[PDB]
């Protein structure tokens, strides 16, 4: 436009964990002159894992070349990891995007697309064993950066790394202004956001509850890895 | 259902600040047996302040009696504060809801509805002077609780108070399980989420940028107060 419009794109897919997307979306959409896209095979309604309905704004084919791509996570990642069109789109955009990012098991989609080989990366704690088969150097940190690749472990990690992106695309003062204008000042009333700080009973419950999903996602991951290896 | 379904409702209005809604929505929608509603004058598309499109699931008339009501904030609050139908709906639901909650300037809607008189409450820092005219005892804390009323100051305060609500509706272990399963572990890369911690230059920028909106919202607030006083 009259200024350089940073093109920011989020993959929006059925059964996305919507907050993984909508958090970084609202932060990045607050930045000067940007244009933010919600990308799927087609524009139109896409249902998140909660049933909340989001609207894709562009197809893969019509999406502009992105400066920032972000792959959120959620239940729908398992399908996406074997979606040949989606993986081809992600590889195309990642080839030249200044920033390639993900939240939770969105990094396993990056991995299935061949974008994690030899890269430090994280994913959701319950699925962290799935990084190494996709070639990643697995790291247990809230946001892992390797060059222009930023992978966030937990649900709101994109809110936090969105401020990092703001600071580099614009300047620190701009990032701080957005944080203050939004009044982003988290203070959770529990300390159970990590398996290392939650009560052991709670960790055991969570790991038992994720077992079938992990088992399926492991099968998917190993198929994805085998494709990359061939 | 086979268990007691807690009815949780968010006001979804044009020019909502979407993350104020979508954060607490994803947390609360994770809880056992709940049914979560996005409420407007009619079901269907509602455009957030960023342009992101959300879908209302129910009209005011068809919304069940709520156990939890939450009024998010955003630019669209100014209109809502003088929307006779919306204010009547909020008063009806608030009369019996176990919890009445808001995020950012959503509390000014509660105030316009007459629900803050003599109550401790907060709102977005840039608009905090608008609490006293609506009868509130203004408090500068991230989440202010007065009985069953919970008002959150900043954009993601609903994520945090949603975990408090989880713990009381269910139990602490349930709230902790949800925090761990979502991996909600915030760690912002800047400390500018409060006017007391942001750099002075950044505060000055933010206050200059909010001046016209504050001026208009003040006019609206004083009209709303005068209606309550009559």
Spatial neighbors of B15 by CB under 8 A, at least 6 apart, are: B47, B48, B49, B74, B75, B76, B79
B47 touches chain A (CB under 8 A): no
Pairwise CB contact (< 8 Å): A163 & B52: no
CB A90 within 8 A of CB A111: no
* Strands A149-152, A99-103: pairing kind: parallel
* Sign of the C-alpha dihedral computed for residues A27, A30, A35 and A36 taken in this order: positive
Beta carbons of A174 and B149 less than 8 angstroms apart: no
B 115-134 → A contacts, CB under 8 A: 124-126
Distance between CA B204 and CA A90 in Å, rounded?
A: 41
Here the tokens at position B134 are 């609506």
Domain-wise residue ranges, chain A: 1-230
Task: Enumerate residues 6+ apart whose C-beta is below 8 A from B140.
Answer: B122, B125, B128, B153
Distance CA B48, CA B45 (A): 10
Region at A82 (left for phi over 0; alpha for psi -120 to 50; beta for the rest): alpha
Q: In chain A, what residues touch B124 (CB-CB under 8 Å)? A: 183
Q: Tell me, in Å, the resolution of the deposited structure.
A: 1.0
A200 touches chain B (CB under 8 A): no
3-class state of residue B111 by DSSP: helix
Nearest by Cα to A126 from B30, B4, B180: B180
DSSP letter at B76 equals T
CB of B206 within 8 Å of a chain A CB? The answer is yes
Q: How was this structure determined?
A: X-ray
Task: Tell me, yes or no, if B36 comes closer than 8 A to chain A by beta carbon.
Answer: yes
> CB B183 to CB A194 under 8 A?
yes
What gap in Å lies between CA B86 and CA B110, rounded to an integer?
10
Q: Give yes or no for a contact between A24 and A143, defined as CB atoms under 8 angstroms apart.
A: no
Give phi and psi for A134, each to the nearest 5. Answer: -95, 10
The CB density around residue A187, as the number of other CB atoms within 10 Å, is 14
Residue A168: list chain B partners with CB under 8 A: none
Name the E strands within chain B: 7-11, 35-40, 44-47, 53-56, 58-59, 68-71, 99-103, 120-121, 137-138, 143-146, 149-152
Within 59-98 of A, beta carbons closer than 8 Å to B belong to: none
Give yes or no for a contact between B7 and B33, defined as CB atoms under 8 angstroms apart. no
Residues 6+ apart with CB under 8 A from B107: B71, B73, B116, B121, B122, B123, B131, B136, B151
B158 interface with A at CB cutoff 8 Å = no
- Cα–Cα dist A62/A70, whole Å: 17
Counting one residue from chain A and one from chain B, the pairs whose CB atoms sit within 8 A come to: 224
> Min CA distance, A194 vs chain B (Å)?
6
Pick the CATH number of B1-230 from 3.40.50.1000, 3.40.50.880, 3.90.190.20, 3.30.565.10: 3.40.50.880
């Amino acid at each position: 436009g009259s200024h350089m419009a940073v093109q920011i794109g989020f993959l929006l897919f059925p059964e996305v964990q919507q907050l993984e997307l909508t958090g970084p979306h609202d932060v990045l959409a607050s930045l000067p002159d940007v244009q933010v896209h919600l990308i799927w095979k087609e524009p139109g309604p896409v249902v998140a894992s909660s049933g909340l309905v989001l609207q894709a704004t562009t197809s893969f084919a019509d999406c502009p070349p992105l400066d920032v791509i972000c792959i959120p996570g959620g239940t729908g990642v398992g399908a996406l990891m074997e979606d040949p069109q989606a993986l081809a789109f992600i590889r195309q955009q990642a080839a030249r995007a200044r920033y390639v990012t993900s939240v939770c098991t969105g990094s396993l989609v990056l991995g299935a697309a061949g974008l994690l080989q030899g890269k430090r990366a994280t994913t959701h704690w319950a699925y962290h064993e799935l990084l190494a088969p996709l070639g990643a150097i697995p790291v247990h940190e809230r946001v892992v950066r390797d060059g222009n690749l930023l992978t966030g472990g937990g649900i709101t990690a994109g809110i936090d790394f969105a401020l990092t992106l703001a600071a580099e695309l614009f300047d620190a003062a701009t990032a701080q202004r957005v944080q203050l204008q939004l009044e982003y000042a988290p203070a959770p009333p529990f300390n159970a956001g990590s398996p290392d700080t939650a009560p052991a009973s709670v960790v055991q419950q969570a790991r038992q509850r994720a077992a079938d999903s992990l088992h399926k996602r492991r099968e998917i991951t190993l198929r994805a890895a085998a494709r990359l290896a061939a």
